[PDB]
């Protein structure tokens, strides 16, 4: 890869500078280079990887949704035939999105997950695997679409099983996992009641453990709890 000649530390440094400059494509390329050095990632480095790709894929998903909506509208009744361009362009963005997802899943499979023994790292990476299969599922329509959905569910479930055994109910990674798995249930799996149940149980079990936390831990846990609550408000 293009980052093979740069020092690991220099790639991390530059990932932080790219974040400051809102250059998330560059940030992701730096973090990919850092992963490909073959060493395990620290807590802070795992977060840099996640922020970089969340921003890249986030712009792509936003674009895809705009284009999809235009495409749907063009296929209505009474709609004037505008040619193949909207579908082609949606396809171009889709393919680029799928390529970023495949890239992140490949970093996770080669070899981040297998080397991740501590609960914090393993759960983080399996949550990420669930999330990027979920992004694949958002645009899937083919022979393999049920398998993409099942791949997200399996990764999330394995993360959930470890998190419940190894992490307190307020751990932010456990919370964010449960949040994202509830969104998977609502948006992907057609399981709104599972989504609602999961968000409620997560919120309540976190509430009961807040008393154990420092002020700074409390702030992080309650921030994610607030998003659970806000989703529950919307869903009910």
């Amino acid at each position: 890869g293009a980052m093979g000649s740069m020092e690991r530390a220099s790639l991390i440094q530059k990932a932080k500078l790219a974040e400051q400059a809102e250059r998330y494509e560059d940030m992701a390329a730096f973090m990919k280079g850092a992963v490909e050095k073959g060493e395990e990632l620290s807590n802070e480095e795992r977060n840099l990887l996640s922020v970089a790709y969340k921003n890249v894929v986030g712009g792509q998903r936003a674009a895809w949704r705009v284009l999809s909506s235009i495409e749907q509208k063009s296929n209505e009744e009474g709609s004037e035939e505008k040619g193949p361009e909207v579908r082609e362009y949606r396809e171009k963005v889709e393919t680029e999105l799928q390529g970023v997802c495949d890239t992140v899943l490949g970093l996770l499979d080669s070899h981040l997950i297998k080397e991740a023994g501590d609960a914090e790292s393993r759960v983080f990476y399996l949550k990420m695997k669930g999330d990027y299969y979920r992004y694949l599922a958002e645009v899937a329509t083919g022979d393999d679409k049920k398998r993409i959905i099942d791949s997200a569910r399996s990764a999330y479930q394995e993360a959930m099983d470890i998190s419940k055994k190894e992490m307190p109910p307020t751990n932010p990674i456990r919370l964010g996992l449960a949040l994202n798995f509830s969104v998977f249930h609502y948006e992907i799996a057609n399981s709104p009641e599972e989504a609602i149940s999961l968000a409620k149980t997560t919120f309540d079990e976190a509430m009961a453990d807040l008393h154990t936390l420092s002020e700074d831990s409390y702030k992080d846990s309650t921030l994610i709890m607030q998003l659970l609550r806000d989703n529950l408000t919307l869903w009910t």
Binding site: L179, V183, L223
Partner: peptide, 9 residues
């Protein structure tokens, strides 16, 4: 609904 990445910070 929001996912984790949507939260600021």
């Amino acid at each position: 609904c929001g996912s984790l990445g949507n939260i600021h910070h």
